[model samples]
Target: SSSFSFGGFTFKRTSGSSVKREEEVLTGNLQTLKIRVHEGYEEFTMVGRRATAILRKATRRLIQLIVSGRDEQSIAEAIIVAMVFSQEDCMIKAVRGDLNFVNRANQRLNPMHQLLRHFQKDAKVLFQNWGVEPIDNVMGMIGILPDMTPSIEMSMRGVRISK
Candidate 1:
């Protein structure tokens, strides 16, 4: 029964060198959400309870990082990751909402197709307010891990490394 909303600003040049201001509002339902980090990995059945728990833990860890005087980069990463999870959560919820429409129809009727539009517009406003770049860059960095492949066979074979 709850929703989220963000505002956007638009400026237009008017006659006599006056600037006109316009406001746009983006809003959506928050029934639940999910997001995946990458495209090319095998996956098993996904399992998670209480999607909201993720945001809670991430936010709490952020406060801890600040309190314990973590480095800026680490803190920055924490913030971005928290936001990334939030985005994923919202996207998952949107997907579910879309399916609800699809199934409630004749089962072949295309759903309203508005949920994704809301997502994109809301993300644009979100990044703008955060003074951050577009969501693509922010969202793409979440699942990346350092290369552990090169050392795997070497370590198994009891060999030393030479970079």
Candidate 2:
């Protein structure tokens, strides 16, 4: 698909008071990553192309570490940090007015949200670093809500099941 549409945020200066707002990849290739802020108004200046680049570089470094097979605890911790950073990056774009990311011409598949989903799944070992048996306040480190629904699924033979 040359062009695609995805939900996002955008800052619009209305009649009087303005309302405000706010990636892709070749699997693991940093060279394939690019960020473009949708044009219209200037609200999220910090989260423009530069922010994307910063995020891309950060992810690239982490990817390298992942592939390098560094120590278990270190790598796990690194990924957790990266995921949190990415969450902030996406949040900035959303609030700055980059709402609704869609590659109308399919220039690239850089859905920032999906990029984050992958990060969350890949960086599941953050707790491994907390020496304490159960860090009561640590779960908030990833910005999850107290009412989040938990879904656990497993593949047995062929069919998928959840609990």
Candidate 3:
């Protein structure tokens, strides 16, 4: 579905002051990822089309690494280091709880089904890199949370089930 709505911040000169003020604004659609701030600032200017491209490219690189059976630790490092160079002030939230390292790892039954242990320590090194706040539920944003109900169901041995 194309129907979507997300939020981001923008710096604008306030009515009473000349200094730039960060204001929350609704922006973007389903295809693109969300960033903390919009373009126009000196340091964090990768917004609009460019920011989405950057995000897509980053995910693409990681996807290839995962598909090719690269070490998850190295992949985690690669992802963390990739964002350090640019202070984009971005956040990554995946669609349908896919397209992330852990999810990809498990889907292929990678050696390390438990990828969080490997990534978490590395993540600490680059903690808040690019102003990204570490989410408590790291998987929640890009994964199916425990609260969700199952989409598919099965009846055991045809016990006269009726809809």
Candidate 4:
């Protein structure tokens, strides 16, 4: 006879020109976790390798935090921040002409689009600090719609599923 025990959680990626999904294991004595990144809208530059690595790292960190008994709110917030940074990193690569860096300095910088630009810049700084260089023109060329926003949704499962 075979018996099965199950406990899992699903996270749907919020809409923002890109989308992904994550699944993790929580429950039982053995520690196990998994993440699934759904296909997202593709940018001009090829960033499959970079995106995969970022997501894997982020997911592993999240699992580590959870297993280490980090508070729910803290883990949730960190995941959201990580996702934003990851998206920005991917976008930036597409903007810089896939590392060709065509000296297109004349591109207008609109204050109205400052937020997206700011996030892209921040991502670049963070990546550089980590010794990672995302494609330069990815973000600028792909174009961020003011309407497209990123949000987080969470769910818990286990004996205290509703909690």
Compose the digit string of candidate 4's lDDT tens values, residues 36-100: 44354322111121121112223212211111113333233332333333333232332321111
lDDT of 2 by residue, 30-104 (tens): 223344433232111011111111112222121111111123333233333333333333322222212233466
What TM-score do all the candidates reach, one by one? Answer: 0.19, 0.21, 0.20, 0.18
Per-residue accuracy of model 3 over 1-163 as CA lDDT, tens digit each: 1112111212122112113324332211233322232233122111221111122222112111111013333223333332322222232311122323455445532212212232333444233321221222332222111121111232111011111
> Superposing all C-alpha atoms, what RMSD in Å does each candidate have to the true structure?
18.8, 16.6, 19.7, 20.8
* Alpha carbon deviation, residue 34, candidate 4 (Å): 32
lDDT of each: 0.25, 0.26, 0.23, 0.26
Clashes of each: 4, 23, 0, 13
Q: How does model 2 score by TM-score? A: 0.21
CA displacement after TM-score superposition, residue 11 of candidate 1 (Å): 41
Q: What TM-score would candidate 1 get against the native?
A: 0.19
RMSD of 4: 20.8
Q: Ten consecutive residues with minimal summed lDDT in candidate 1? A: 60-69
For model 1, residues 1-163, the per-residue Cα lDDT tens digits are 1222221111121111122323221224433222222222111111112111112222101111011112323322333333333233322333323323234544632222333334333333322233211112232222111122222222211111121
Give me the runs in candidate 1 sitting further than 4 Å from their true place.
1-54, 57-69, 88-128, 131-163
